[PDB]
Amino acid sequence: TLELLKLIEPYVAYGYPSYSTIRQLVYKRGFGKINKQRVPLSDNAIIEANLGKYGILSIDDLIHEIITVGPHFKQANNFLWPFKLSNPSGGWGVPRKFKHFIQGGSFGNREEFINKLVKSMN
Amino acid sequence: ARRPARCYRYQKNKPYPKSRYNRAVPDSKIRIYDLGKKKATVDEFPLCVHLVSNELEQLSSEALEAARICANKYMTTVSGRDAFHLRVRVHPFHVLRINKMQQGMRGAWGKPHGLAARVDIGQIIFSVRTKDSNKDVVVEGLRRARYKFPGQQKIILSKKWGFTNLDRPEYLKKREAGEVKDDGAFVKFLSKKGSLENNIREFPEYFAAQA
Amino acid sequence: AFQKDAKSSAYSSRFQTPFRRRREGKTDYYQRKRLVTQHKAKYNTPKYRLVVRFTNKDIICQIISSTITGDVVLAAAYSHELPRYGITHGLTNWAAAYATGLLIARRTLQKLGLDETYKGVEEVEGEYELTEAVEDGPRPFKVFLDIGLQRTTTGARVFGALKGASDGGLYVPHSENRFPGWDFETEEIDPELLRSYIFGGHVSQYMEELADDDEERFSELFKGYLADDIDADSLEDIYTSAHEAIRADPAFKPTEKKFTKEQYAAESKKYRQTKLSKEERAARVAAKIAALAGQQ
Amino acid sequence: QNPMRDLKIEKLVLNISVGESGDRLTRASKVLEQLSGQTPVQSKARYTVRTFGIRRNEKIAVHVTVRGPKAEEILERGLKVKEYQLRDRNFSATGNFGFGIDEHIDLGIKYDPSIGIFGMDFYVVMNRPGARVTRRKRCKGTVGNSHKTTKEDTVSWFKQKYDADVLDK
Amino acid sequence: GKSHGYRSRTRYMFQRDFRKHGAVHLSTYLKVYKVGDIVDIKANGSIQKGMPHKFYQGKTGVVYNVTKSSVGVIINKMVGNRYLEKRLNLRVEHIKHSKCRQEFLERVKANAAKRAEAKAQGVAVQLKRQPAQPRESRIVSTEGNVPQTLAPVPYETFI
RNA sequence: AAGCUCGUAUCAGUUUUAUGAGGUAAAGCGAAUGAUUAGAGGUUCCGGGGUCGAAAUGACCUUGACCUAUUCUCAAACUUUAAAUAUGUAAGAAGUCCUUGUUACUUAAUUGAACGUGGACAUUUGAAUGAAGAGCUUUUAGUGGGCCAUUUUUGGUAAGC
RNA sequence: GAGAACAGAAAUCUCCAGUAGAACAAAAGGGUAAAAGCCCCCUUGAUUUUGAUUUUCAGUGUGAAUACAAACCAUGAAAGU
RNA sequence: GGUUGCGGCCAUAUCUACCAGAAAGCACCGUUUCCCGUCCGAUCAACUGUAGUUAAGCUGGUAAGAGCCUGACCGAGUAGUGUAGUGGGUGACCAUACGCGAAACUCAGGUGCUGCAAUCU
Ligand SMILES: [Mg+2]
Ligand SMILES: [Mg+2]
Ligand SMILES: [Mg+2]
Ligand SMILES: [Mg+2]
Ligand SMILES: [Mg+2]
Ligand SMILES: [Mg+2]
Ligand SMILES: [Mg+2]
Ligand SMILES: [Mg+2]
Ligand SMILES: [Mg+2]
Ligand SMILES: [Mg+2]
Ligand SMILES: [Mg+2]
Ligand SMILES: [Mg+2]
Ligand SMILES: [Mg+2]
Ligand SMILES: [Mg+2]
Ligand SMILES: [Mg+2]
Ligand SMILES: [Mg+2]
Ligand SMILES: [Mg+2]
Ligand SMILES: [Mg+2]
Ligand SMILES: [Mg+2]
Ligand SMILES: [Mg+2]
Ligand SMILES: [Mg+2]
Ligand SMILES: [Mg+2]
Ligand SMILES: [Mg+2]
Ligand SMILES: [Mg+2]
Ligand SMILES: [Mg+2]
Ligand SMILES: [Mg+2]
Ligand SMILES: [Mg+2]
Ligand SMILES: [Mg+2]
Ligand SMILES: [Mg+2]
Ligand SMILES: [Mg+2]
Ligand SMILES: [Mg+2]
Ligand SMILES: [Mg+2]
Ligand SMILES: [Mg+2]
Ligand SMILES: [Mg+2]
Ligand SMILES: [Mg+2]
Ligand SMILES: [Mg+2]
Ligand SMILES: [Mg+2]
Ligand SMILES: [Mg+2]
Ligand SMILES: [Mg+2]
Ligand SMILES: [Mg+2]
Ligand SMILES: [Mg+2]
Ligand SMILES: [Mg+2]
Ligand SMILES: [Mg+2]
Ligand SMILES: [Mg+2]
Ligand SMILES: [Mg+2]
Ligand SMILES: [Mg+2]
Ligand SMILES: [Mg+2]
Ligand SMILES: [Mg+2]
Ligand SMILES: [Mg+2]
Ligand SMILES: [Mg+2]
Ligand SMILES: [Mg+2]
Ligand SMILES: [Mg+2]
Ligand SMILES: [Mg+2]
Incomplete structure (x- = not known):
């Protein structure tokens, strides 16, 4: 998967998310694929209804399985609809976007700055 | 007749030298490449100065010889016939073509028109060797030759001894040690590999473990 | 090595060495390929060659099958084994080759199981025949004659060994135009002459041909034949008796312990010299630099 | 140190370079025949020059290879003609040697004008025993340096036998 | 014209x-x-x-x-x-046996082998290939390994 | 466009792992081949000169080409080496393994070959990520002047060629 | 390369070295050394029957080619070809 | 361990120059009636194992040997290269970012391993 990320470095921005970032992401923009049919979770009953087999029955259960890469991360992740984020509010912080993060750009792997960017876009 | 040198400054094509196929190339306008006391010994000229190209262009044989005679002349007329060894390290094997003007551009594959040398960036064009007492002179000679070329080229003093790959200190060490061996225009070095007897007949001064 | 002929580094570098068994002028690969290679649709059935070689006056008869890791010998019979069966001198003669052929024939037949069956031809009248298959029975063992680099000439001992194996029972597809007694122009074979060669009629004829014309050469040539009181007349029977002895017992038993291999390994390692140490030659050259370049 | 490094004669080949074909050549052939006793071999022209007036495959020469005592016989029969006197040249650095003789009647052979007189090139190829390695089929190999013929070693053998001559630098 | 022969x-x-x-x-x-x-x-x-x-x-x-x-x-x-x-x-x-499946066959035999051991003892299968996982924590010591501070070097010519 | 057979089944302009294939880039030339600068050292009964020469298969200088170890520089149709990007195959139930029938092929041979009967081991059943599923059939439109940009690249001094 | 009357730069004879620097109709590129080249011996498989396959491709045709089946033959001691 | 017959990989095996090699085995080696082949019993065919040799073949060892094989943060993270930018530069060309990454060079080590059968102080 790291090779995949390398193969798409100039079109995305990515990093290491913190517990706070993942929690706020699932809480505000976390939707599950239920018969595809994207559904806002909004209740631990939905998670239990589908991720129950793997032992996930709460929104925080999902968050934990995600943060700590778990034995059922593939299912817990493919169950979450791709988060639809809005453009960052405070801005991008750089003049041009399609330059690596190292070159005063926006794409590439900012290691922890991904959290600031996501929080600004969520 | 001779097309302006600007028409072939860049390496737009793949090397097209004289061959079994081209086979109708004119003679290179530059034929002598070693000038001065080319028979001198390496010890005779420790100083070496290079005229190195700072571009990726092509130099016509015409300009090549023109600059050669310019430089060599200045150098001799202010230094003396046997006061320097001027070697040119650029041989123009690239053949330039041309389309001689009731027809149009139908099948317009030219005929050889001239020769030129393809030089990279940082490639040495002129290599002159003298003794430090002449540096200013040979430098000015290469400077005057510079004007006969297209594209930036810079002069640089070599850290090596004359036309040898060893920096002066390393050469002094080896020679004042006993592993050097004069030759007509160049020198040979004592190797540690091969036949011991054939290695002792040559370089006999050495093995005394002293100068 | 005239200096005008020495080879250069480039010559040696760009030189391609042939196969070892070729550089030793021992294997004709262009022939080995066509003899060994087997029909790809059978896929394990080995092509058995009957290698017959000639040392200087000693016959070798092995039955081999090739393997990617190395030819494996099924049966082996050396003509030097003839004393056991009844022959003492010249085990290079056509009759010796035929003897070894018949020997290996019966030896392998017994090692296989086709001993009582496929007994070959016993009353050898010197006829041209091949070991035919048995009605409603296992087909005979088939082997192909490997003469190596031998030059195929009409009437050679290699073909004599061939006749011996075929007469023994092995199925060796073969013609008759290279058997002693073959008429060059007219297409007829002389079985009287072939039988003669099978027994020694030419060697026996030579014996009684020299016995009354030159006793001065018969003196040493054939010396043993006299040292053992036996003239030409006898020869046919010594061979025939050997034939009966071989057909009766093809057993091959080997040589006695006789100073066993570990002992041999020791008494030969004494003469086997082992390579020197790198430091050894390092000092061996340092001593030379001191003794030669150091002003004596 | 030679108890078997004894120099024998491999062969002696006589050669008449009769410049053209025809009667002259069948005559030089008949001479070679009653000089050898063996049927000689004819040599065809390799290429065509026309200054020598020859043509490709013209059958313009004859020779004969003789080995053993017969070779020693004719060798001496010619050594006599040359008075047992050779030169430092005429010897191959490889060990062999040869000479030439016009006046082929000096070899005993009578005149017989129905055949004329002819010249002949004599070439003697020498070798120690065991030369069979280089000429056999199986295990064809090369003989050791110390074992094969030398030029000095062969002139020394030549002088020792018949004491004939060396004669110059 | 153009040439498009078999070889x-x-x-x-x-x-x-x-x-x-x-x-x-x-x-x-x-x-x-x-x-x-x-x-x-x-x-x-x-x-x-x-x-x-x-x-x-x-x-x-x-x-x-x-x-x-x-x-x-x-x-x-x-x-x-x-x-x-x-x-x-x-x-x-012009043919050569292929080793494109050698890994698969070797892994199938090893798989069944340790699967047999698995059912022998308390079953813990653990026999599916997984890609290279990222490295884990480690403690680098400086005992006899103090660091050499490096700086960029200036421009030289060497010819 | 019409649909049809199915549906956690297979599916993939992607990665990974194992295993192949290649002769471009670069490189090389005191390696082959083909070019190319410079000396130095050898060599002729064997190129021409040319002093001593009556000549010499004669000594000697001379310039030549050949041999030796070096030297400067090169290749679309040169090359030992040799990438990157692209490219073939495999990653299980159509698997793996054992027991031993059929035949006219094949074997010295119930030897093998191919196809089978009985039996043993279940979703960590054999990498990743994804999948608004997968697979299948019929019929018919328009089109068959193309042009442009980064990069590779041929011709041409070049061109909005 | 060194050697042999006429014989010379070039005729024929001998030995040594020789990775192919040769030859294999022809263009070139592959390939080839107890051969694929050179000398010799024996032959007509350059034959008979109808299919499949590869390249060009529409996976039509034609040209050329490959590997089997069924015959009848050639060569070789033979495996074989 | 030697040796032979047949081998697999086909130079760590080849090339050059020397030196050593018991036993056995190979070999060279003797002969021309017979089969057979030659200009020539040199090759090829046959006979002898008798008469003779380790001289050569063959085996091993020696060499700051040539060649060859292997290795290395030796050179070199260089050359080249996939991807990015409204980066530099008149241009030629060039630097940077996320990756992949040679050849030469240099130095060090090595010089056949091994299958089947028979045979040997
Ligand atoms: Mg604000
Ligand atoms: Mg605002
Ligand atoms: Mg802006
Ligand atoms: Mg917001
Ligand atoms: Mg370009
Ligand atoms: Mg162009
Ligand atoms: Mg025009
Ligand atoms: Mg017009
Ligand atoms: Mg034209
Ligand atoms: Mg650069
Ligand atoms: Mg300028
Ligand atoms: Mg250099
Ligand atoms: Mg060299
Ligand atoms: Mg070869
Ligand atoms: Mg053959
Ligand atoms: Mg001796
Ligand atoms: Mg004439
Ligand atoms: Mg074309
Ligand atoms: Mg790959
Ligand atoms: Mg190329
Ligand atoms: Mg290139
Ligand atoms: Mg290279
Ligand atoms: Mg070259
Ligand atoms: Mg006088
Ligand atoms: Mg270049
Ligand atoms: Mg792929
Ligand atoms: Mg693909
Ligand atoms: Mg998968
Ligand atoms: Mg999924
Ligand atoms: Mg679905
Ligand atoms: Mg349509
Ligand atoms: Mg249509
Ligand atoms: Mg059209
Ligand atoms: Mg249409
Ligand atoms: Mg139209
Ligand atoms: Mg675009
Ligand atoms: Mg245009
Ligand atoms: Mg050709
Ligand atoms: Mg026809
Ligand atoms: Mg086409
Ligand atoms: Mg179609
Ligand atoms: Mg049609
Ligand atoms: Mg077709
Ligand atoms: Mg057709
Ligand atoms: Mg054909
Ligand atoms: Mg002995
Ligand atoms: Mg013989
Ligand atoms: Mg010895
Ligand atoms: Mg031997
Ligand atoms: Mg050896
Ligand atoms: Mg070496
Ligand atoms: Mg790049
Ligand atoms: Mg730019």
Whole structure:
């Protein structure tokens, strides 16, 4: 998967998310694929209804399985609809976007700055 | 007749030298490449100065010889016939073509028109060797030759001894040690590999473990 | 090595060495390929060659099958084994080759199981025949004659060994135009002459041909034949008796312990010299630099 | 140190370079025949020059290879003609040697004008025993340096036998 | 005009593997092929008979027919937007048993092996290949390993 | 466009792992081939000169080409080496393994070959990520002047060629 | 390269070295050394029957080619070809 | 361990120059009636194992040997290369970012391993 990320470095921005970032992401923009049919979770009953087999029955259960890469991360992740984020509010912080993060750009792997960017876009 | 040198400054094509196929190339306008006391010994000229190209262009044989005679002349007329060894390290094997003007551009594959040398960036064009007492002179000679070329080229003093790959200190060490061996225009070095007897007949001064 | 002929580094570098068994002028690969290679649709059935070689006056008869890791010998019979069966001198003669052929024939037949069956031809009248298959029975063992680099000439001992194996029972597809007694122009074979060669009629004829014309050469040539009181007349029977002895017992038993291999390994390692140490030659050259370049 | 490094004669080949074909050549052939006793071999022209007036495959020469005592016989029969006197040249650095003789009647052979007189090139190829390695089929190999013929070693053998001559630098 | 012969452009492809010319060793004639085997295709410039077309060089296929001097190899060739079945009659001299499945077979045997051990003791299967996971924590010591501070070097010329 | 057979089944302009194939880039030339600068050292009964020469298969200088170890520089149709990007195959139930029938092929041979009967091991059943599923059939439109940009690249001094 | 009357730069004879620097109709590129080249011996498989396969491709045709089946033959001691 | 017959890989095996090699085995080696082949019993065919040799073949060892094989943060993270930018520069060309990454060079080590059968102080 790291090779995949390398193969798409100039079109995305990515990093290491913190517990706070993942929690706020699932809480505000976390939707599950239920018969595809994207559904806002909004209740631990939905998670239990589908991720129950793997032992996930709460929104925080999902968050934990995600943060700590778990034995059922593939299912817990493919169950979450791709988060639809809005453009960052405070801005991008750089003049041009399609330059690596190292070159005063926006794409590439900012290691922890991904959290600031996501929080600004969520 | 001779097309302006600007028409072939860049390496737009793949090397097209004289061959079994081209086979109708004119003679290179530059034929002598070693000038001065080319028979001198390496010890005779420790100083070496290079005229190195700072571009990726092509130099016509015409300009090549023109600059050669310019430089060599200045150098001799202010230094003396046997006061320097001027070697040119650029041989123009690239053949330039041309389309001689009731027809149009139908099948317009030219005929050889001239020769030129393809030089990279940082490639040495002129290599002159003298003794430090002449540096200013040979430098000015290469400077005057510079004007006969297209594209930036810079002069640089070599850290090596004359036309040898060893920096002066390393050469002094080896020679004042006993592993050097004069030759007509160049020198040979004592190797540690091969036949011991054939290695002792040559370089006999050495093995005394002293100068 | 005239200096005008020495080879250069480039010559040696760009030189391609042939196969070892070729550089030793021992294997004709262009022939080995066509003899060994087997029909790809059978896929394990080995092509058995009957290698017959000639040392200087000693016959070798092995039955081999090739393997990617190395030819494996099924049966082996050396003509030097003839004393056991009844022959003492010249085990290079056509009759010796035929003897070894018949020997290996019966030896392998017994090692296989086709001993009582496929007994070959016993009353050898010197006829041209091949070991035919048995009605409603296992087909005979088939082997192909490997003469190596031998030059195929009409009437050679290699073909004599061939006749011996075929007469023994092995199925060796073969013609008759290279058997002693073959008429060059007219297409007829002389079985009287072939039988003669099978027994020694030419060697026996030579014996009684020299016995009354030159006793001065018969003196040493054939010396043993006299040292053992036996003239030409006898020869046919010594061979025939050997034939009966071989057909009766093809057993091959080997040589006695006789100073066993570990002992041999020791008494030969004494003469086997082992390579020197790198430091050894390092000092061996340092001593030379001191003794030669150091002003004596 | 030679108890078997004894120099024998491999062969002696006589050669008449009769410049053209025809009667002259069948005559030089008949001479070679009653000089050898063996049927000689004819040599065809390799290429065509026309200054020598020859043509490709013209059958313009004859020779004969003789080995053993017969070779020693004719060798001496010619050594006599040359008075047992050779030169430092005429010897191959490889060990062999040869000479030439016009006046082929000096070899005993009578005149017989129905055949004329002819010249002949004599070439003697020498070798120690065991030369069979280089000429056999199986295990064809090369003989050791110390074992094969030398030029000095062969002139020394030549002088020792018949004491004939060396004669110059 | 243009030339599009059967062996056109195969100069280097069919070249002889310099210092490996001459007759082919017998191991290639001793190797055996069975229907269904996976073989590689590499033309042998020495044997002109039964050689494969240039397109099949470097291609792997399956054996569908075994004959006296050759083998029948099945190859899937992409023509347009679809794949077609092509049957090649190649001489053994241009075939090589393939190791593309060697890892799979070795892993299947090892898998069943430790699976048997697994059911022998408390079952813990753990036998599926996983990609390279990222490194874990570690403690780097400086005992006898103090760091060499490095700085960039200036410009030199060396000629 | 019409649909049809199915549906957690297979499916993939992607990665990974194992295993192949290649002769471009670069490189090389005191390696082959083909070019190319410079000396130095050898060599002729064997190129021409040319002092001593009556000549010499004669000594000697001379310039030549050949041999030796070096030297400067090169290749679309040169090369030992040799990438990157692209490219073939494999990653299980159509698997793996054992027990032993059929035949006219094949074997010295119930030897093998191919196809079978009985039996043993279940979703960590054998990498990743994804999948608004997968597979299949018929019929018919328009089109069959193309042009442009980064990069590779041919011709041409060049061109909005 | 060194050697042999006429014989010379070039005729024929001998030995030594020789990775192919040769030859294999022809263009070129592959390939080839107890051969694929050179000398010799025996031959007509350059034959008979109808299929499959590869390249060009529409996976039509033609040209050329490959590997089998069924015959009748050639050569070789033979495996074989 | 030697040796032979047949081998697999086909130079760590080849090339050059020397030196050593018991036993056995190979060999060279003797002969021309017979089969057979030659200009020539040199090759090829046959006979002898008798008469003779380790001289050569063959085996091993020696060499700051040539060649060859292997290795290395030796050179070199260089050359080249996939991807990015409204980066530099008149241009030629060039630097940077996320990756992949040679060849030469240099130095060090090595010089056949091994299958079947028979045979040997
Ligand atoms: Mg604000
Ligand atoms: Mg605002
Ligand atoms: Mg802006
Ligand atoms: Mg917001
Ligand atoms: Mg360009
Ligand atoms: Mg162009
Ligand atoms: Mg015009
Ligand atoms: Mg017009
Ligand atoms: Mg034209
Ligand atoms: Mg650069
Ligand atoms: Mg300028
Ligand atoms: Mg250099
Ligand atoms: Mg060299
Ligand atoms: Mg043969
Ligand atoms: Mg001796
Ligand atoms: Mg004439
Ligand atoms: Mg074309
Ligand atoms: Mg070869
Ligand atoms: Mg053909
Ligand atoms: Mg790959
Ligand atoms: Mg190239
Ligand atoms: Mg290049
Ligand atoms: Mg290179
Ligand atoms: Mg070169
Ligand atoms: Mg006088
Ligand atoms: Mg270049
Ligand atoms: Mg791929
Ligand atoms: Mg793909
Ligand atoms: Mg998967
Ligand atoms: Mg999924
Ligand atoms: Mg679905
Ligand atoms: Mg349509
Ligand atoms: Mg249409
Ligand atoms: Mg049209
Ligand atoms: Mg249409
Ligand atoms: Mg139109
Ligand atoms: Mg665009
Ligand atoms: Mg345009
Ligand atoms: Mg050709
Ligand atoms: Mg025809
Ligand atoms: Mg076309
Ligand atoms: Mg179609
Ligand atoms: Mg049609
Ligand atoms: Mg067709
Ligand atoms: Mg057709
Ligand atoms: Mg002995
Ligand atoms: Mg013989
Ligand atoms: Mg000795
Ligand atoms: Mg031997
Ligand atoms: Mg050796
Ligand atoms: Mg070495
Ligand atoms: Mg790049
Ligand atoms: Mg730019």
